[PDB]
Design an enzyme around this catalytic site. Structure first.
Site, PDB file in Angstrom:
ATOM      1  N   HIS A 155       9.407  10.556 -13.095  1.00 11.03           N
ATOM      2  CA  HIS A 155       9.947   9.214 -12.886  1.00 11.03           C
ATOM      3  C   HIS A 155      11.269   9.046 -13.604  1.00 11.03           C
ATOM      4  CE1 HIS A 155       9.879   5.200 -11.423  1.00 11.03           C
ATOM      5  NE2 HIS A 155      10.083   4.749 -12.653  1.00 11.03           N
TER       6      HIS A 155
ATOM      7  N   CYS B 278       0.785  -1.223   0.000  1.00 12.15           N
ATOM      8  CA  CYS B 278       0.000   0.000   0.000  1.00 12.15           C
ATOM      9  C   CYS B 278       0.817   1.273   0.000  1.00 12.15           C
ATOM     10  CB  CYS B 278      -0.865   0.013   1.300  1.00 12.15           C
ATOM     11  SG  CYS B 278      -1.663  -1.593   1.578  1.00 12.15           S
TER      12      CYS B 278
ATOM     13  N   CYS C 285       1.595   3.571  -3.205  1.00 15.52           N
ATOM     14  CA  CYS C 285       0.619   4.530  -3.675  1.00 15.52           C
ATOM     15  C   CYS C 285       0.168   5.522  -2.616  1.00 15.52           C
ATOM     16  CB  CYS C 285      -0.612   3.832  -4.245  1.00 15.52           C
ATOM     17  SG  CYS C 285      -0.299   2.964  -5.818  1.00 15.52           S
ATOM     18  N   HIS C 286       0.107   5.089  -1.361  1.00 14.13           N
ATOM     19  CA  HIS C 286      -0.414   5.955  -0.307  1.00 14.13           C
ATOM     20  C   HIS C 286       0.652   6.547   0.579  1.00 14.13           C
ATOM     21  CE1 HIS C 286      -4.621   5.223  -1.307  1.00 14.13           C
ATOM     22  NE2 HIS C 286      -4.335   3.930  -1.398  1.00 14.13           N
TER      23      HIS C 286
ATOM     24  N   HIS D  12       6.447   5.861 -20.151  1.00 16.54           N
ATOM     25  CA  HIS D  12       7.513   5.217 -19.400  1.00 16.54           C
ATOM     26  C   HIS D  12       8.675   4.952 -20.346  1.00 16.54           C
ATOM     27  CE1 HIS D  12       9.874   2.150 -17.362  1.00 16.54           C
ATOM     28  NE2 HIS D  12       9.352   2.657 -16.241  1.00 16.54           N
TER      29      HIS D  12
ATOM     30  N   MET E 250       4.226  -5.759  -9.513  1.00 13.35           N
ATOM     31  CA  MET E 250       4.849  -6.224 -10.750  1.00 13.35           C
ATOM     32  C   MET E 250       4.779  -7.736 -10.875  1.00 13.35           C
ATOM     33  SD  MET E 250       5.789  -3.693 -12.670  1.00 13.35           S
ATOM     34  CE  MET E 250       7.195  -4.124 -13.705  1.00 13.35           C
TER      35      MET E 250
HETATM   36  C1  DHE Z   1      13.238   5.174  -9.875  1.00 13.45           C
HETATM   37  C2  DHE Z   1      13.369   3.973 -10.853  1.00 13.45           C
HETATM   38  C3  DHE Z   1      14.145   3.887 -11.931  1.00 13.45           C
HETATM   39  C4  DHE Z   1      15.191   4.882 -12.496  1.00 13.45           C
HETATM   40  C5  DHE Z   1      16.640   4.575 -12.113  1.00 13.45           C
HETATM   41  C6  DHE Z   1      17.746   5.475 -12.480  1.00 13.45           C
HETATM   42  O1  DHE Z   1      17.544   6.548 -13.087  1.00 13.45           O
HETATM   43  O2  DHE Z   1      18.928   5.110 -12.126  1.00 13.45           O
HETATM   44  C7  DHE Z   1      13.916   2.575 -12.521  1.00 13.45           C
HETATM   45  C8  DHE Z   1      14.573   2.095 -13.635  1.00 13.45           C
HETATM   46  C9  DHE Z   1      14.519   0.778 -14.063  1.00 13.45           C
HETATM   47  C10 DHE Z   1      15.333   0.234 -15.137  1.00 13.45           C
HETATM   48  C11 DHE Z   1      16.311   1.077 -15.968  1.00 13.45           C
HETATM   49  C12 DHE Z   1      16.428   0.804 -17.445  1.00 13.45           C
HETATM   50  C13 DHE Z   1      17.316   1.672 -18.258  1.00 13.45           C
HETATM   51  O3  DHE Z   1      17.593   1.314 -19.432  1.00 13.45           O
HETATM   52  O4  DHE Z   1      17.769   2.735 -17.716  1.00 13.45           O
HETATM   53  C14 DHE Z   1      15.043  -1.065 -15.225  1.00 13.45           C
HETATM   54  C15 DHE Z   1      15.620  -2.125 -16.197  1.00 13.45           C
HETATM   55  C16 DHE Z   1      14.046  -1.373 -14.228  1.00 13.45           C
HETATM   56  C17 DHE Z   1      13.460  -2.605 -14.032  1.00 13.45           C
HETATM   57  C18 DHE Z   1      12.432  -2.880 -13.159  1.00 13.45           C
HETATM   58  N1  DHE Z   1      11.894  -1.960 -12.274  1.00 13.45           N
HETATM   59 FE1  DHE Z   1      12.434  -0.027 -12.009  1.00 13.45          FE
HETATM   60  N2  DHE Z   1      11.146   0.108 -10.472  1.00 13.45           N
HETATM   61  C19 DHE Z   1      10.985   1.200  -9.626  1.00 13.45           C
HETATM   62  C20 DHE Z   1      11.688   2.395  -9.776  1.00 13.45           C
HETATM   63  C21 DHE Z   1      12.624   2.752 -10.731  1.00 13.45           C
HETATM   64  N3  DHE Z   1      13.011   1.879 -11.750  1.00 13.45           N
HETATM   65  C22 DHE Z   1       9.975   0.908  -8.654  1.00 13.45           C
HETATM   66  O5  DHE Z   1       9.546   1.898  -7.560  1.00 13.45           O
HETATM   67  C23 DHE Z   1       9.485  -0.301  -8.939  1.00 13.45           C
HETATM   68  C24 DHE Z   1       8.251   0.170  -9.748  1.00 13.45           C
HETATM   69  C25 DHE Z   1       9.165  -1.217  -7.881  1.00 13.45           C
HETATM   70  C26 DHE Z   1       9.974  -1.449  -6.896  1.00 13.45           C
HETATM   71  O6  DHE Z   1       9.520  -1.537  -5.690  1.00 13.45           O
HETATM   72  O7  DHE Z   1      11.211  -1.648  -7.050  1.00 13.45           O
HETATM   73  C27 DHE Z   1      10.255  -0.846 -10.036  1.00 13.45           C
HETATM   74  C28 DHE Z   1      10.111  -2.103 -10.588  1.00 13.45           C
HETATM   75  C29 DHE Z   1      10.893  -2.629 -11.601  1.00 13.45           C
HETATM   76  C30 DHE Z   1      10.776  -3.987 -12.111  1.00 13.45           C
HETATM   77  O8  DHE Z   1       9.762  -4.996 -11.564  1.00 13.45           O
HETATM   78  C31 DHE Z   1      11.767  -4.151 -12.992  1.00 13.45           C
HETATM   79  C32 DHE Z   1      11.036  -4.309 -14.372  1.00 13.45           C
HETATM   80  C33 DHE Z   1      12.691  -5.282 -12.754  1.00 13.45           C
HETATM   81  C34 DHE Z   1      13.431  -5.272 -11.682  1.00 13.45           C
HETATM   82  O9  DHE Z   1      14.661  -5.644 -11.722  1.00 13.45           O
HETATM   83  O10 DHE Z   1      12.998  -4.930 -10.543  1.00 13.45           O
HETATM   84  N4  DHE Z   1      13.749  -0.216 -13.518  1.00 13.45           N
HETATM   85  C1  HEC Z   2      -1.927   2.209  -6.432  1.00 13.18           C
HETATM   86  C2  HEC Z   2      -2.270   1.645  -7.631  1.00 13.18           C
HETATM   87  C3  HEC Z   2      -2.747   1.734  -5.187  1.00 13.18           C
HETATM   88  C4  HEC Z   2      -2.439   0.751  -4.340  1.00 13.18           C
HETATM   89  C5  HEC Z   2      -1.302  -0.291  -4.418  1.00 13.18           C
HETATM   90  C6  HEC Z   2      -3.441   0.755  -3.292  1.00 13.18           C
HETATM   91  N1  HEC Z   2      -4.279   1.840  -3.481  1.00 13.18           N
HETATM   92 FE1  HEC Z   2      -5.610   2.559  -2.166  1.00 13.18          FE
HETATM   93  N2  HEC Z   2      -6.271   3.849  -3.554  1.00 13.18           N
HETATM   94  C7  HEC Z   2      -5.654   4.157  -4.756  1.00 13.18           C
HETATM   95  C8  HEC Z   2      -6.483   5.088  -5.488  1.00 13.18           C
HETATM   96  C9  HEC Z   2      -6.132   5.616  -6.895  1.00 13.18           C
HETATM   97  C10 HEC Z   2      -7.532   5.390  -4.718  1.00 13.18           C
HETATM   98  C11 HEC Z   2      -8.714   6.346  -5.001  1.00 13.18           C
HETATM   99  C12 HEC Z   2      -8.568   7.796  -4.530  1.00 13.18           C
HETATM  100  C13 HEC Z   2      -7.478   8.569  -5.241  1.00 13.18           C
HETATM  101  O1  HEC Z   2      -6.421   8.772  -4.596  1.00 13.18           O
HETATM  102  O2  HEC Z   2      -7.728   8.924  -6.417  1.00 13.18           O
HETATM  103  C14 HEC Z   2      -7.409   4.629  -3.493  1.00 13.18           C
HETATM  104  C15 HEC Z   2      -8.286   4.679  -2.427  1.00 13.18           C
HETATM  105  C16 HEC Z   2      -8.145   3.996  -1.237  1.00 13.18           C
HETATM  106  C17 HEC Z   2      -9.000   4.127  -0.074  1.00 13.18           C
HETATM  107  C18 HEC Z   2     -10.240   5.047  -0.021  1.00 13.18           C
HETATM  108  C19 HEC Z   2     -10.186   6.235   0.943  1.00 13.18           C
HETATM  109  C20 HEC Z   2     -11.257   7.276   0.719  1.00 13.18           C
HETATM  110  O3  HEC Z   2     -11.064   8.403   1.231  1.00 13.18           O
HETATM  111  O4  HEC Z   2     -12.244   6.916   0.025  1.00 13.18           O
HETATM  112  C21 HEC Z   2      -8.522   3.317   0.873  1.00 13.18           C
HETATM  113  C22 HEC Z   2      -9.045   3.054   2.301  1.00 13.18           C
HETATM  114  C23 HEC Z   2      -7.324   2.688   0.346  1.00 13.18           C
HETATM  115  N3  HEC Z   2      -7.131   3.104  -0.958  1.00 13.18           N
HETATM  116  C24 HEC Z   2      -6.569   1.753   1.010  1.00 13.18           C
HETATM  117  C25 HEC Z   2      -5.582   0.982   0.434  1.00 13.18           C
HETATM  118  C26 HEC Z   2      -4.905  -0.120   1.074  1.00 13.18           C
HETATM  119  C27 HEC Z   2      -5.157  -0.552   2.535  1.00 13.18           C
HETATM  120  C28 HEC Z   2      -4.057  -0.630   0.177  1.00 13.18           C
HETATM  121  C29 HEC Z   2      -3.091  -1.844   0.390  1.00 13.18           C
HETATM  122  C30 HEC Z   2      -3.769  -3.073   0.302  1.00 13.18           C
HETATM  123  C31 HEC Z   2      -4.190   0.103  -1.046  1.00 13.18           C
HETATM  124  N4  HEC Z   2      -5.144   1.101  -0.884  1.00 13.18           N
HETATM  125  C32 HEC Z   2      -3.462  -0.093  -2.202  1.00 13.18           C
HETATM  126  C33 HEC Z   2      -4.500   3.547  -5.226  1.00 13.18           C
HETATM  127  C34 HEC Z   2      -3.876   2.451  -4.657  1.00 13.18           C
END
Ligand code: DHE
Ligand code: HEC
Ligand code: DHE
Ligand code: HEC
Lengths: 559, 559
Positions: A337, A57, A60-61, A380, A98
């Protein structure tokens, strides 16, 4: 209405790429007290909920629950909603992470209740990670003066590929011509990217847990010569690339704490830590968790280029004086990003992904020059793809996670003025869920993956456009479909093809066939001239191969 | 042990000048739940303790309890100490605040228990105050187009004095030559300082509650033309002083939230808010509450000079582009407070008071030049005093809150290189508790107050040194003692004399004879040439007169 979760929390092709703080989740946290009218969770219950929150969670939050792509979920707000609402909403299911390693987004009944109660309690901020903590983790295995003074192995270092073996917490150094796995090095936790010093000697890797390793490619048997921990969650690292500053510094960016750190380029000694907490650029409101995303290095000034996601700021950090620190904080667009430099290496073009914008910075003048909507959903680019379009001139391309589109932006303000910083064309590739687009100056082809597409046929394939055939009539360019996964001969589980990376000469392009940790994966090498299969790299050690970085193309920012 | 509070928690002459967050203490707070081993306080008890904490303790320990001049008091640390220790330690009381309004520091048995319990609970962070909040508070009473295009009153604006009538929430505009009160204007509760735009047209005042008023001195009847609130607690404001940027911007600094705001110089529209949360310069550890102290304006570049206290950073903020914001974050020394420019207006000389240091910045080159210990305890210069010492050349002087010493630092690297940035002399004045030192180019005298001295006679007098007679031979220069409070003829109480301020010609110097809100106060005007009483200003409207600012000397930084 709690039924809104069906849409809000629905798994899409463009909402799976949000942070999973699974390293930070390992920290054991004590249960807070519960104010009047709120039921307390035991230490065990609270810790169980906290782990889930950080893993599924917090991306996103926010870990502090102040909102990121999803809205804030602080106790003031959640207590107004009430337990019933929270329980109902959460029962539907959260967006999946992912593929292969990410969460499914489904919880048991007991877990749903833990989550709802957790959201009603007051969260503590996770521990900070400052200079004292960094220095405690800092280890110099081979002091600079004890390292080689010349390359001692017979490797062709510039044609070497550094390949992430994700789930194993290892990297594979693979020969670009023989395809031999030269070495498999361990770092502990999963590596996110590999970056090279400007001289090509030092290989830097950053683990998702904030662990940085620096490897000396000149050793007879290359290994880690220094390591340090820079935070609890991190994804980015870069090296100094201004002429005259080769090997001087490295910089790492963290998600938690929200900070970046400049380190000595030879030892990893932590020199300057900067917090990224601050104000959003547009509404100018304090944001307590602005994560560092991509970090690039200027070729025009002795500066690092740092994306700060939640506040929508691009920082130009001058490393010539770390005590009297000069920075330029550029108001850009929220949700920055990834991105890359144009072909001339002067302009930084970056995706403000949730807002579908490309932000353009002039690294020479240190100012924003453009913000343009791509017309697509959730661009992306990775570092993107630069090429000279036959009719438009120099362009930079990106694909999208949220749709099948490829957009081109003009990158030549002096030479093609009307086209500069404008979206010149948009056309379809294989389908939505794309992550990486790639080309090379020696190639006439533009390769586009579709990693996160729900259809196996598409996710396991790559679209290839012929740049020489592009006209500018407004019609959609045709593409050839390469059946990369099929070529690798792996149908088990669900292999996802990801990220093209070229060899030094630009005559071959590699793709990762990414399967689960207990499944078979591969690397597929494509002959760029013929667009035919050249070689398949398979090995029992090749676990969850993802990012691949050629030494020469990475050190020189050739893309 | 608990008896260590006899040294650390008793009133010193130099520990009474720490922030009292009495505006922020008026906000109601929610009582937190208590974890195992800790007892919860009711809503009333928690609010009663919070109010006491904010008014008396937060200055030294922080509202977030992460430490300032006093150590951190976070729950992890206090729970290890335990209730019994806390109770015993707090029974002694705390250091008194400022006379005539500040706390005595005495606590009753019940209050002691409340404070000990409060310290064991988890504190919430007070509300943030961003652009939305500022704009809601932003009122333009007279738009720029409706204001005069030339001076429409017959006042001598450059010789006017803007005097804080502290507890009345007003300022008085007093004719520098006739001593007539031209007008009394309503403002923020206890205006801390007045500052003037570079043209001398606009008068800016900031209240301790964060309220800013902008007054147009050209109106037939000068009044507030615009107002805005920039925070919950604030003490500093300044105007743009680089040639070509007259009247363009104003900047305000806040204690809470930890931030500074750049406003339009004509309307007060909030343009750029910058958080000061960040890393300490030396230990490089995150600090969540780095208060903004003095703010000055560069005469060499289009920059504002911002002191950030707890992190020990001096910021040079370039206001030529607020979107692509250039700053220089200079690592200096912790506990930066006040300071001034040297005679040439090139070097910023500021007190890191708690560390007994003077930090010197070169505003032309944007770099730290020196850090020197004054040899005294807790330097508090105000803007300080620049003069030409007969032996040493150009010097800048400061007095101290903690002892009777006056220190001189050489300020002429070009003409007197051997004396530059060195402490050249240190000699005694009246006694400890000094706040302000003053001189003027046309005067041969150096005036030093002793406002916080515990001896009534001393606190009601000023020391005056003859600069012409100074030899710098190591002996203690003689001083004349002016019985300022005696001259004012005030029967009741023990009024404190504070802050010399000259008229435009530098022929007369004013002092405030500061008594309680319901008591009799005065302003005393001294003839600089003879050191004799020139005039005593008394009026029923002259309530708690404190800061006084001559328009010309403030707009030009003549001190
Ligand atoms: C901030 C960021 C960058 C830029 C780095 C830089 O400029 O040095 C990046 C780049 C990347 C790049 C850079 C590619 C390039 O050509 O520069 C790759 C291959 C990559 C493969 C993945 N990324 Fe990435 N990635 C994240 C964040 C980022 N990834 C996440 O927050 C995320 C979404 C999840 C996480 O919790 O880690 C995530 C999941 C992934 C994958 O599941 C990937 C596909 C595989 C993996 O190894 O985890 N990310
Ligand atoms: C990113 C894709 C998300 C993840 C992972 C989880 N949530 Fe989330 N949540 C997301 C969105 C886009 C929204 C709608 C509101 C907005 O920001 O546009 C929400 C909403 C909730 C709410 C509703 C609260 C309200 O005021 O109505 C709750 C309680 C919430 N989300 C909880 C929650 C939890 C516990 C998560 C982990 C399992 C979770 N979210 C994941 C986006 C995303
Ligand atoms: C940060 C700061 C500045 C620099 C202003 C700038 O650069 O624009 C300053 C300057 C000042 C100056 C500037 C004089 C000058 O010549 O520049 C004066 C007169 C002044 C009169 C007082 N100050 Fe001040 N003062 C504080 C802070 C500050 N005071 C406090 O935190 C403190 C200690 C307590 C508080 O909670 O406010 C405090 C109490 C006082 C007083 O009790 C004074 C004496 C009277 C009053 O009106 O409240 N402070
Ligand atoms: C500035 C003049 C202070 C004010 C006002 C208050 N405190 Fe303080 N405190 C201060 C110092 C210099 C010290 C000693 C340690 C150091 O930082 O050098 C302390 C110590 C405490 C302690 C002891 C904690 C320990 O670890 O032993 C406590 C519990 C404490 N202070 C509480 C406290 C309270 C409740 C106050 C308001 C009434 C308060 N302090 C005011 C400096 C200053």
């Amino acid at each position: 209405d709690p039924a809104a979760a069906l849409e809000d929390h629905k798994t899409r092709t463009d909402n799976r790429y949000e942070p999973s703080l699974d390293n930070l989740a390992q920290q054991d946290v004590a249960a807070p007290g519960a104010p009047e009218g709120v039921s307390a969770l035991s230490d065990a219950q609270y810790n169980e909920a906290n782990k889930i929150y950080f893993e599924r969670c917090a991306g996103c939050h926010g870990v502090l629950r102040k909102g990121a792509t999803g809205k804030a979920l602080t106790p003031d707000l959640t207590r107004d909603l009430g337990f019933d609402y929270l329980q109902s909403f959460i029962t539907y299911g959260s967006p999946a992470g992912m593929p292969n390693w990410g969460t499914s987004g489904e919880l048991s009944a007991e877990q749903v209740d833990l989550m709802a109660n957790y959201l009603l309690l007051d969260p503590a901020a996770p521990p900070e990670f400052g200079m004292k903590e960094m220095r405690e983790s800092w280890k110099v295995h081979v002091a600079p003066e004890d390292r080689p003074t010349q390359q001692e192995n017979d490797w062709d270092l510039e044609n070497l590929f550094s390949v992430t073996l994700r789930d194993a917490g290892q990297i594979a150094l693979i020969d670009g011509a023989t395809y031999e796995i030269k070495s498999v090095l361990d770092t502990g936790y999963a590596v996110h990217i590999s970056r090279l010093s400007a001289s090509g000697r030092y290989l830097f890797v950053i683990g998702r847990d904030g662990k940085v390793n620096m490897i000396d490619l000149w050793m007879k048997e290359p290994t880690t010569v220094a390591e340090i921990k820079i935070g609890s969650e991190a994804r980015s690292i870069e090296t100094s690339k201004m002429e005259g500053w080769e090997d001087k510094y490295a910089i790492a960016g963290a998600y938690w704490p929200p900070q970046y750190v400049i380190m000595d380029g030879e030892t990893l000694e932590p020199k300057k830590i900067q917090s990224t907490r601050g104000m959003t650029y547009d509404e100018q409101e304090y944001h307590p968790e602005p994560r560092v995303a991509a970090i690039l290095a200027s070729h025009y000034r002795p500066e690092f280029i740092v994306n700060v996601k939640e506040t929508g700021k691009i920082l130009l950090v001058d490393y010539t004086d770390l005590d009297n620190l000069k920075t330029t904080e550029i108001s850009a667009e929220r949700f920055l990003h990834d991105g890359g430099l144009d072909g001339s290496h002067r302009y930084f073009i970056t995706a403000a992904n949730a807002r579908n914008k490309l932000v353009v910075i002039d690294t020479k003048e240190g100012k924003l020059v453009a913000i343009e909507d791509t017309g697509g959903q959730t661009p992306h680019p990775g570092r993107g793809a630069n090429f000279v379009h036959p009719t438009f001139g120099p362009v930079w391309a990106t694909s999208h996670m949220g749709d099948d589109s490829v957009a081109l932006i003009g990158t030549d303000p002096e030479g093609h003025p009307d086209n500069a910083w404008k979206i010149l064309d948009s056309f379809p590739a294989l389908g939505g869920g794309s992550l990486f687009i790639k080309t090379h100056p020696n190639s006439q082809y533009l390769y586009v993956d579709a990693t996160l597409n729900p259809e196996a046929e598409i996710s396991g394939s790559v679209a290839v456009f012929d740049i020489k055939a592009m006209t500018g009539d407004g019609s959609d360019p045709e593409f050839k479909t390469l059946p990369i996964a099929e070529w690798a001969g792996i149908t088990e589980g669900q292999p996802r093809v990801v990220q093209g990376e070229f060899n030094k000469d630009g005559t071959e392009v590699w793709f990762s066939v990414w399967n689960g940790k207990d499944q078979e994966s591969a690397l597929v090498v494509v002959d760029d001239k013929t667009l035919e299969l050249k070689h398949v790299i398979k090995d029992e050690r090749l676990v969850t191969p993802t990012g691949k970085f050629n030494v020469y193309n990475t050190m020189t920012d050739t893309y």
